[PDB]
Swiss-Prot record:
Residues 1-35 form the bZIP domain. Phosphorylated by the cyclin-CDK PCL5-PHO85. This is General control transcription factor GCN4. The chain holds residues 247 to 281 of 281 of the full protein. It comes from Saccharomyces cerevisiae (strain ATCC 204508 / S288c). Disruption phenotype: Abolishes recruitment of the mediator complex to the upstream activating sequence (UAS) of amino-acid starvation responsive genes. Decreases RNA level of genes involved in amino acid biosynthesis and cofactor biosynthesis during amino acid starvation or methyl methanesulfonate stress. Growth dependent on amino acid supplementation. Sensitive to amino acid starvation. Sensitive to purine starvation. Decreases cellular glycogen levels during glucose starvation. The gene is GCN4. Master transcriptional regulator that mediates the response to amino acid starvation. Binds variations of the DNA sequence 5'-ATGA[CG]TCAT-3' in canonical nucleosome-depleted 5'-positioned promoters, and also within coding sequences and 3' non-coding regions. During nutrient starvation (low or poor amino acid, carbon or purine sources), it activates genes required for amino acid biosynthesis and transport, autophagy, cofactor biosynthesis and transport, mitochondrial transport, and additional downstream transcription factors.
Amino acid sequence: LQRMKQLEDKVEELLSKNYHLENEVARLKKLVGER
């Protein structure tokens, strides 16, 4: 099915960025507390 080896690289690439995106929102929201 979906994500067998090919779509794995695509779907994984999501977390690699999306999971990293929440990290920015944190550093961002804190940057609005001391810039």
